[PDB]
Amino acid sequence: ATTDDLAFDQRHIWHPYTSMTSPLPVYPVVSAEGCELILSDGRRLVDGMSSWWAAIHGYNHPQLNAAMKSQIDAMSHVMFGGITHAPAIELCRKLVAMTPQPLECVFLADSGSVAVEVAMKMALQYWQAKGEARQRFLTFRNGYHGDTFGAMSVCDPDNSMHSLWKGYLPENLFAPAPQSRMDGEWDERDMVGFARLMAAHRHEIAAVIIEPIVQGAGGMRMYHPEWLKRIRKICDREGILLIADEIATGFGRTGKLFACEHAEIAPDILCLGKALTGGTMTLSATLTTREVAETISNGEAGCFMHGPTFMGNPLACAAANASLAILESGDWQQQVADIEVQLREQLAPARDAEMVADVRVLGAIGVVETTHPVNMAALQKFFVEQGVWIRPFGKLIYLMPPYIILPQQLQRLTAAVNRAVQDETFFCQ
Amino acid sequence: ATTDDLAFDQRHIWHPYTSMTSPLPVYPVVSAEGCELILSDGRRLVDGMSSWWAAIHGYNHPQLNAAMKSQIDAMSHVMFGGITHAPAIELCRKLVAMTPQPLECVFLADSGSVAVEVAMKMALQYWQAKGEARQRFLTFRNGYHGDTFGAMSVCDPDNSMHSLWKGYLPENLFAPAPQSRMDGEWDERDMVGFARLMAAHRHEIAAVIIEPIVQGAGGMRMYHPEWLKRIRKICDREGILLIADEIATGFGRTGKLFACEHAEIAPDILCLGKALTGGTMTLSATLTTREVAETISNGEAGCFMHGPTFMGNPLACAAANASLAILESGDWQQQVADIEVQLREQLAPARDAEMVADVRVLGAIGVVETTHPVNMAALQKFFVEQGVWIRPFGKLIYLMPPYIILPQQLQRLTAAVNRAVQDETFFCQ
Numbered sequence: 022a023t024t025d026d027l028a029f030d031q032r033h034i035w036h037p038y039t040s041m042t043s044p045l046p047v048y049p050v051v052s053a054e055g056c057e058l059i060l061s062d063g064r065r066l067v068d069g070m071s072s073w074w075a076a077i078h079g080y081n082h083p084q085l086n087a088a089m090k091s092q093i094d095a096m097s098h099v100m101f102g103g104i105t106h107a108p109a110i111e112l113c114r115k116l117v118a119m120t121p122q123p124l125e126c127v128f129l130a131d132s133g134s135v136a137v138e139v140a141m142k143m144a145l146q147y148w149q150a151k152g153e154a155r156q157r158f159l160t161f162r163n164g165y166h167g168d169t170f171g172a173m174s175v176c177d178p179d180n181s182m183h184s185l186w187k188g189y190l191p192e193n194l195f196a197p198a199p200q201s202r203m204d205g206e207w208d209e210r211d212m213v214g215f216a217r218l219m220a221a222h223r224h225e226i227a228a229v230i231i232e233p234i235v236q237g238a239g240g241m242r243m244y245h246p247e248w249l250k251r252i253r254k255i256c257d258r259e260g261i262l263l264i265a266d267e268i269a270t271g272f273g274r275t276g277k278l279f280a281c282e283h284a285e286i287a288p289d290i291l292c293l294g295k296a297l298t299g300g301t302m303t304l305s306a307t308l309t310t311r312e313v314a315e316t317i318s319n320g321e322a323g324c325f326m327h328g329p330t331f332m333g334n335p336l337a338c339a340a341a342n343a344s345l346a347i348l349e350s351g352d353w354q355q356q357v358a359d360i361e362v363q364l365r366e367q368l369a370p371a372r373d374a375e376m377v378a379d380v381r382v383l384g385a386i387g388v389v390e391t392t393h394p395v396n397m398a399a400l401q402k403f404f405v406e407q408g409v410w411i412r413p414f415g416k417l418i419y420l421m422p423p424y425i426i427l428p429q430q431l432q433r434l435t436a437a438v439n440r441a442v443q444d445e446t447f448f449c450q
Numbered sequence: 451a452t453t454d455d456l457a458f459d460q461r462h463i464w465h466p467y468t469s470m471t472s473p474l475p476v477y478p479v480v481s482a483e484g485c486e487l488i489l490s491d492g493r494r495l496v497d498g499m500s501s502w503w504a505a506i507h508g509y510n511h512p513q514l515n516a517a518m519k520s521q522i523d524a525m526s527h528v529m530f531g532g533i534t535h536a537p538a539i540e541l542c543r544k545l546v547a548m549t550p551q552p553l554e555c556v557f558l559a560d561s562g563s564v565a566v567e568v569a570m571k572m573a574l575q576y577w578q579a580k581g582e583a584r585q586r587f588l589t590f591r592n593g594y595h596g597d598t599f600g601a602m603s604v605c606d607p608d609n610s611m612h613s614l615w616k617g618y619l620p621e622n623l624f625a626p627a628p629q630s631r632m633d634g635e636w637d638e639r640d641m642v643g644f645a646r647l648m649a650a651h652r653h654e655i656a657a658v659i660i661e662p663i664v665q666g667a668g669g670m671r672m673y674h675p676e677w678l679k680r681i682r683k684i685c686d687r688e689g690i691l692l693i694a695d696e697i698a699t700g701f702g703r704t705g706k707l708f709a710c711e712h713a714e715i716a717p718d719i720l721c722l723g724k725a726l727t728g729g730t731m732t733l734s735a736t737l738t739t740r741e742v743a744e745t746i747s748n749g750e751a752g753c754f755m756h757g758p759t760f761m762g763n764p765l766a767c768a769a770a771n772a773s774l775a776i777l778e779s780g781d782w783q784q785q786v787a788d789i790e791v792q793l794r795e796q797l798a799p800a801r802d803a804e805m806v807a808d809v810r811v812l813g814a815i816g817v818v819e820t821t822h823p824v825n826m827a828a829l830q831k832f833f834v835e836q837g838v839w840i841r842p843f844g845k846l847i848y849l850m851p852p853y854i855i856l857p858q859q860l861q862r863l864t865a866a867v868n869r870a871v872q873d874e875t876f877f878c879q
């Protein structure tokens with residue numbers, strides 16, 4: 022019965038970065054609760070992914086659910102043009118309140134990529150209004166900022182295989198990936214490439230854009246906070262805008278509410294998403310300073326030229342309010358600290374495995390980088406059999422569980438990672 | 451209280467295309483039901499906008515609400531990587547079934563702009579996979595496809611103030627706006643700019659992208675269906691992909707389920723959004739032909755390189771299924787027909803106003819085009835005070851009520867429009 026469904030899905034439905042010619046199997050999920058995904062056949066999976074960062078409160082959270090159902094009773098949606106409403110205002114109040122002081126103007130959007138493109142567009146309009154046609158962005162390699170064309174143009178030029186897009190995408194400036202680790206000692210030579218690029222191009226750079234501390238989808242790399250302090254200083258001296266993409270790192274995942282706090286710096290533009298809504302549905306936010314906001318607004322345009330149809334969607338704002346309200350308890354701090362400790366401890370053995378190239382842990386992020394890319398289909402199948410949901414990518418078998426994950430649940434995950442990495446059959450050499 | 455909310459909104463929250471220095475007043479909506487928005491002060495506004503096309507079932511629709519809440523109970527969201535679920539499969543089943551026969555591959559995304567960029571990426575990967583680096587898009591003037599950089603690059607260069615983006619945005623090809631009206635007869639001279647551009651670049655064009663029949667946000671234009679027939683044949687001749695952006699026209703608004711049906715043509719790529727979810731929340735879909743899907747998939751990438759975090763969001767899909775299920779009753783056909791009849795008759799008097807340059811109606815769309823741009827603040831204030839919510843744009847005062855609007859409700863809208871165009875204080879000359 023559901024095998025006819027899976028057949029329709031296989032034949033008609035794209036999934037993220039998949040082939041319609043030879044799609045790989047996908048598992049049917051019927052529901053989810055706490056930290057468990059429930060398949061059609063009833064088997065339960067402990068979630069190690071938070072549905073990619075965002076589901077930090079796990080699934081079927083009573084408070085998120087209630088907040089969503091209430092907003093639906095008022096209105097799930099109304100347009101934002103000439104109209105405002107309580108959920109957008111409350112959400113923005115919470116966002117302005119919890120972010121670094123200068124960030125006080127909020128542009129709500131629908132997705133991470135759109136938030137990034139909004140940030141980029143802000144930087145571009147800023148310099149138009151200041152009369153300097155700056156159009157380049159300076160970023161890091163191993164960056165990932167989304168799949169829309171603006172966002173691609175600041176993603177790593179190799180990973181996004183921009184070679185196939187090199188011609189459509191404008192060429193931005195890419196400093197080397199930050200090499201100094203976050204459990205690292207800082208090394209001053211790390212700064213050399215970035216500084217040179219700045220020096221050679223400081224006049225055409227509208228903004229520097231980086232994922233602070235954790236380069237997520239670009240490799241789950243965790244680099245030294247000194248990088249943010251220097252880039253912040255470098256940006257200040259050149260008057261270049263700093264765009265911090267915290268779409269992945271936002272709302273506590275790295276042990277701090279925003280990864281920028283690891284460096285105690287503030288961006289000129291801050292992109293948020295994913296866990297913003299507690300992973301219930303899509304929403305994003307791009308915050309900026311009053312200075313950027315006024316400059317753009319006093320430009321030739323007379324406004325910031327962006328407006329998604331479903332901008333400020335009340336239902337998503339309500340879910341965010343609820344998600345942010347749960348974080349207000351502050352329980353996430355210890356939860357994330359405890360997950361971090363347990364991940365360091367339980368993933369440590371993997372360092373000795375021959376298939377493992379590195380193990381790094383930060384907040385509720387646990388990463389086992391392997392020497393050869395994983396055999397996706399085979400390893401995915403293995404994980405389901407171990408009763409866990411772990412979604413590896415390339416040479417990364419990583420964990421980012423909901424903050425409410427129970428220690429025995431986290432244990433099942435780390436045990437599954439350790440067991441998988443010992444065995445070379447789950448890897449392609 | 452709400453006076454402090456509004457002050458915070460004004461001081462901190464962007465709205466679509468808004469200034470942070472001098473924002474216009476926005477009206478606080480606390481809830482909505484049927485075709486009415488309810489402001490804080492208890493006054494009810496008859497909705498003439500459907501929250502920009504999308505809310506075709508009006509507000510607080512019980513079937514939508516039931517679907518959304520029920521789906522919340524299972525899971526509002528789970529990742530789509532290596533996972534599929536019933537709301538996504540059902541929605542794709544419906545979409546495949548109701549769209550033109552060759553369209554059978556569905557890529558779910560979160561917003562209209564992303565759907566457009568996905569369509570654009572499909573075409574680009576298509577030609578990259580065939581080993582012909584075609585990278586230019588041919589579109590119409592007065593077209594609108596979103597605010598992201600890729601979508602902007604096929605937006606009208608004047609409305610989009612492309613003078614400010616000319617430098618970052620790759621330059622696409624812009625045929626003249628289709629001049630032949632939809633209640634017009636076809637004028638053969640219309641084709642000259644399009645044919646000449648096509649002939650001059652036909653080897654470097656990856657795709658043609660247009661809004662079928664109704665160019666929405668770019669000028670609420672309604673052009674002759676012969677255009678689709680001609681563009682479809684010419685695209686066939688050159689083997690060029692046709693992208694029909696039905697994000698606005700989809701799901702009945704123009705009297706047919708998809709505006710392409712007015713010409714009985716099928717695009718290679720179809721974009722959907724807005725009314726897709728009954729306007730409950732953001733979601734989009736880009737459909738393509740199996741030929742395109744496999745060509746893309748058999749390229750160097752080995753896949754279609756796109757995957758939003760919230761791809762296939764169960765909740766949005768649930769809403770979409772509900773919305774689509776409502777249309778399955780067929781009630782919309784008569785509802786849209788009746789609104790059309792009533793719109794034509796009741797907007798007719800406006801033609802005689804000195805301030806009115808044109809009046810056009812199609813399906814549940816009524817456009818009163820004026821000779822001068824409307825005075826946004828004053829006219830908006832006027833409308834609210836008349837108890838109607840109509841959001842004019844530039845030189846356009848248009849109505850697109852939910853399909854369920856009552857006749858006495860529609861009469862209030864059309865009455866408000868007629869009264870507004872008689873008075874020139876509501877215009878900037």
Ligand SMILES: Cc1ncc(COP(=O)(O)O)c(CNNC(=O)CSc2ccccc2[N+](=O)[O-])c1O
Pocket residue numbers: 073074132133134135137165166167168232237238239266267268269270294413414531757758759760
């Ligand atoms: C930091 C950051 N910035 C922007 C975006 C774009 O958000 P969208 O919702 O528009 O995509 C993201 C989103 N990242 N998405 C994911 O985490 C999906 S999984 C993924 C993505 C890319 C490469 C690999 C993987 N993976 O499976 O590990 C963002 O993180």
Ligand SMILES: Cc1ncc(COP(=O)(O)O)c(CNNC(=O)CSc2ccccc2[N+](=O)[O-])c1O
Pocket residue numbers: 102328329330331502503561562563564566594595596597661666667668695696697698699723843
């Ligand atoms: C036909 C068509 N295609 C793509 C998009 C992009 O959708 P997003 O959800 O990413 O915005 C749209 C979007 N249309 N948006 C609106 O109707 C908002 S109102 C608007 C937008 C642009 C110019 C003018 C107006 N207006 O106030 O009338 C789309 O329609």
Ligand SMILES: NNC(=O)CSc1ccccc1[N+](=O)[O-]
Pocket residue numbers: 101102103326327328329466467468596597841843844
């Ligand atoms: N891209 N988005 C837009 O162009 C939105 S236009 C708009 C919408 C609602 C209210 C006012 C405006 N406007 O600035 O004219």
